[PDB]
């Protein structure tokens, strides 16, 4: 470690911690920057040499973390948590968690290489027919979104899960062991316990389970209504009205958002078409327009525009030179208070416009907290970070807003149009909830050893069936590693944040809508141009992780806890409608034929 980056001496006291945190921040930006930069260079241009550079950068970060971590423990391990300065306690608490820097050098290098190889496998996996091969984004994504051929959907689903998941399994086992070895040295029973600790709630798992109990009936009704729609297209051979839905038929590789099958389920087809994708295409929208439109919503609230560095540095389309890249959308803070970027293989669709807002929400958070101490440059919890852009996107997707931006000519305000809109939003928001909940239940079980390698797939599918009510369309066994075919697993990005965000965003939306002076139905609120809503949101953003999330939330929405009631209020009309429709249609709610799997197509896979 460069002498300039090494820790000096400080008194074994609070006033010493302060000068310590200051000296840390002075070097930590440089170390954070070099790491993020090396990661960027790799993720926008996956080469062996870029992976090598990224591993060396990670090693340097671990040296830094070890040196500053050991020093924090040297001076404070017996005494440290009684500091009067709460922000200083949070800074120190973070510095002293070494994580993978607890590993001896050889195991650090093993750990860093496993992360690089898992990233490479996921982001370069292909499905091959011909000598021609399909990438996940855009090719397989487009098949899942727009093919209605059971056999073709099956080819893409099986192809992807086999190509990504199978080779990842042995690496993921090794990663899990090393990760646990690392975090056990910080005092945590396993890595999952460390991830859950970010929510600073002793009742976190119970609180989540109680939220889900309130949400589950909404999902069960949406599921039954959708299953019926699919039965009408695919027939009795491929859809069991009392069994799980085949996992490839819901518009999305993970069945996690069902927005792409909106045309099959839309209750009132003769009302305005709320999927504006075809209008974006007809109008000639490109990625640049989508980002500028998202930016203008932020500036309408008197939040910050995207800086020149963002426009100059970002990767907003998949490179056309055919470079391998990580296409999964992400937002980047380089920790130098200047560089902030999005890396997105943007496609011209309505859902992608939502994703642009999601990512830009991350960037806005970064811009607003850039001057806090580097340890406090995080969301009040990770769920807050995931919610910011989604909240704006709730206003953007309203038929009233879409009209304002030239994407929906017809204006209607009637009960059928409301049901259509709420059903569309339910396909995006309600359909996700079981998935958002289950992914880290799976991973917490892996980290804890409740799910050893011999049960990775068995337990994955148990949870997928339990929560989502889906089944794999071909037989799976433990050679398969279907959890690994979801970005966040090989890229070691925690998932519970998304479940938390999907609840939180409605709490935020309700609060901002009230602040805006809006007095109509919550689902028709548009906060566009509300500088009062902007100011309330800015308060959250500027806090970073400097204060307890429960207090930040209380200041914002008037309650110190996650609460499903705003989500339930938002969806109330369609919740009631779906329940009525399912009863009238004689549906079974749930999937009591839990063993059921669809047959294979007759000529599969030939053709
Ligand atoms: C992608 O990464 C590679 C390195 O892994 C870059 O290749 C280097 O490019 C620089 C500047 O053009 C050269 O001077 C080196 O000789 C190159 N090294 C190798 C190993 O080829 C490549 O330029 C990067 N491409 C993009 C588009 O950023
Ligand atoms: C796991 O499954 C692998 C391939 O799937 C199998 O063959 C396809 C065509 C289907 O018939 C499917 O039902 C079968 O499971 C096998 O190559 C592999 O042997 C299986 N793993 C173990 C340990 O048996
Ligand atoms: Cl999280
Ligand atoms: Zn995000």
Task: Measure the CA–CA gap between 440 and 45, rounded to whole angstroms.
Answer: 29
Task: Supply the angle between the helices 14-43 and 48-76 in degrees, to the nearest 10.
Answer: 170
Task: Measure the CA–CA gap between 248 and 242, rounded to whole angstroms.
Answer: 18
3-state secondary structure of 331: strand
Does 593 count as an annotated binding residue?
A: no
* Residue 591 is assigned to a structural domain of this protein: no
* Residue 23 is assigned to a structural domain of this protein: yes
Give DSSP secondary structure letters for 73-115.
HHHHTTTGGG-S-HHHHHHHHHHT--GGGGS-HHHHHHHHHHH
* Residue 245 is assigned to a structural domain of this protein: yes
In this structure, the number of other CB atoms found within 10 A of the CB of residue 475 comes to 8
Residue 598: burial class (beta carbons within 10 Å; 0-12, 13-18, 19+): buried
CA dist 282 to 275, 277, 336, 544, Å? 13, 9, 41, 41
* Residue 597 is assigned to a structural domain of this protein: no
* Residue 340 is assigned to a structural domain of this protein: yes
* Residue 9 is assigned to a structural domain of this protein: yes
**What is the Å distance from ligand 4's center to 162 Cα?**
26
What DSSP designation does 467 have?
I
- Mutate which of 453, 457, 477 for ligand 2 pocket (most atoms within 8 A of beta carbon): 477
> Closest residue (by CA) to atom 11 of ligand 2?
475
Q: Which ligand is nearest to the CA of 162?
A: 2
49 lines ligand 1 (CB under 6 A): yes
* Residue 604 is assigned to a structural domain of this protein: no
**What is the Å distance from ligand 1's center to 46 Cα?**
11
Among candidates 311, 312, 309, 351, which has minimal Cα distance to 329? 351
- Please state whether beta strands 133-135 and 245-246 pair in parallel, antiparallel, or not at all (unpaired): unpaired
The method recorded for this entry reads X-ray
Taking a C-beta distance cutoff of 8 angstroms, is the pair 230, 249 a contact? yes
Please give the helix or strand (H or E) that residue 246 lies within, else none.
strand 245-246
Among candidates 112, 126, 141, which has minimal Cα distance to 42? 112
Residues catalogued as catalytic = 359, 488
Q: Any idea which residue has 């889906």 for tokens?
A: 470
Task: Measure the CA–CA gap between 271 and 177, rounded to whole angstroms.
Answer: 54
What DSSP designation does 138 have?
I
Return phi, psi of residue 582, to 5°. -60, -40
Does 401 count as an annotated binding residue?
A: no
In this structure, the number of other CB atoms found within 10 A of the CB of residue 548 comes to 16
Does 161 count as an annotated binding residue?
A: no
Return phi, psi of residue 333, to 5°. -110, 125
Give DSSP secondary structure letters for 159-212.
HHHHHHHHHHHHHHHHHHHHHHHHHHTTT-SSHHHHHHHTT--TTHHHHHHHHH
Task: Supply the angle between the helices 350-369 and 531-543 in degrees, to the nearest 10.
Answer: 60
Q: For the chain, what is the domain count?
A: 1
**What is the Å distance from ligand 3's center to 531 Cα?**
30
* Residue 595 is assigned to a structural domain of this protein: no
Does 366 count as an annotated binding residue?
A: no
479 lines ligand 2 (CB under 6 A): yes
Q: What is the resolution of this structure in A?
A: 1.5
50 lines ligand 1 (CB under 6 A): yes
Range of the domain at 319: 1-586
23 lines ligand 1 (CB under 6 A): no
């Amino acid at each position: 470690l460069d002498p300039g980056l090494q820790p000096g001496q400080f008194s074994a006291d609070e006033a010493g911690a302060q000068l310590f945190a200051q000296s840390y921040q002075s070097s930590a930006e440089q170390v954070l920057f070099q790491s993020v930069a090396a990661s960027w260079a790799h993720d926008t241009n996956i080469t062996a040499e870029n992976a090598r550079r990224q591993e060396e950068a990670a090693l340097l970060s671990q040296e830094f973390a070890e040196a500053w971590g050991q020093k924090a423990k040297e001076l404070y391990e017996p005494i440290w948590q009684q500091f009067t300065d709460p922000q200083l306690r949070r800074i120190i608490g973070a510095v002293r968690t070494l994580g993978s820097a607890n590993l001896p050098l050889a195991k650090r290098q093993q750990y860093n290489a496993l992360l690089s190889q898992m990233s490479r496998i996921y982001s370069t996996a292909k499905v091959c027919l011909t000598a021609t091969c399909w990438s996940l984004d855009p090719d397989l994504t487009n098949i899942l979104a727009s093919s209605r051929s059971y056999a073709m959907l099956l080819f893409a689903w099986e192809g992807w899960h086999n190509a990504a998941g199978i080779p990842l399994k042995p690496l993921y086992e090794d990663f899990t062991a090393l990760s646990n070895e690392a975090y056990k040295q910080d005092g945590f029973t396993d890595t999952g316990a460390y991830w859950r600790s970010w929510y600073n709630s002793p009742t976190f798992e119970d609180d989540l389970e109680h939220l889900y109990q309130q949400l589950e009936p909404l999902y069960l009704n949406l599921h039954a209504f959708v299953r019926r729609a699919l039965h009408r297209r695919y027939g009795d051979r491929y859809i069991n009205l009392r069994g799980p839905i085949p996992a490839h038929l819901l518009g999305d590789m993970w069945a996690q958002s069902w927005e792409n099958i909106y045309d099959m389920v839309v209750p009132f087809p003769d009302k305005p078409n709320l999927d504006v994708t075809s209008t974006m295409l007809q109008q000639g929208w490109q990625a640049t327009h989508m980002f500028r439109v998202a930016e203008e919503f932020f500036t309408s609230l008197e939040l910050s525009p995207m800086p020149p560095e963002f426009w100059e540095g970002s990767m907003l389309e998949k490179p056309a030179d055919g470079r391998e890249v990580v296409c999964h959308a992400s937002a980047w803070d380089f920790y130098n208070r200047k560089d902030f970027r999005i890396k997105q293989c943007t496609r011209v669709t309505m859902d992608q416009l939502s994703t642009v807002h999601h990512e830009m929400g991350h960037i806005q958070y970064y811009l607003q907290y850039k001057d806090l101490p580097v340890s406090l440059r995080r969301g009040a919890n990770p769920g807050f970070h995931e919610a910011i852009g989604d909240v704006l996107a709730l206003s953007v997707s309203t038929p009233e807003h879409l009209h304002k931006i030239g994407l929906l000519d017809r204006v209607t305000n009637d009960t059928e149009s409301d049901i259509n809109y709420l059903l569309k939003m339910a396909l995006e928001k309600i359909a996700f909830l079981p998935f958002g909940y289950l992914v880290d239940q799976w991973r917490w079980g892996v980290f804890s050893g409740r799910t050893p390698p011999s049960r990775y797939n068995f337990d994955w599918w148990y949870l997928r069936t339990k929560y989502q009510g889906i089944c794999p369309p071909v037989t799976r066994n433990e050679t398969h590693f279907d959890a690994g075919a979801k970005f966040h697993v090989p890229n070691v990005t925690p998932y519970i944040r998304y479940f938390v965000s999907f609840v939180l965003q409605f709490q935020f939306h309700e609060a901002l809508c009230k602040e805006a002076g809006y007095e109509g139905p919550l689902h028709q609120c548009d906060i566009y141009r509300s500088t009062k809503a902007g100011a309330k949101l800015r308060k959250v953003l500027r806090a970073g992780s400097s204060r307890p999330w429960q207090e930040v939330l209380k200041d914002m929405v008037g309650l110190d806890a996650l609460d499903a009631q705003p989500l339930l209020k938002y969806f109330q009309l369609v919740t009631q409608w779906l329940q009525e429709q399912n009863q009238q249609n004689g549906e079974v709610l749930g999937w009591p034929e839990y063993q059921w799997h669809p047959p294979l197509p007759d000529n599969y896979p030939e053709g």
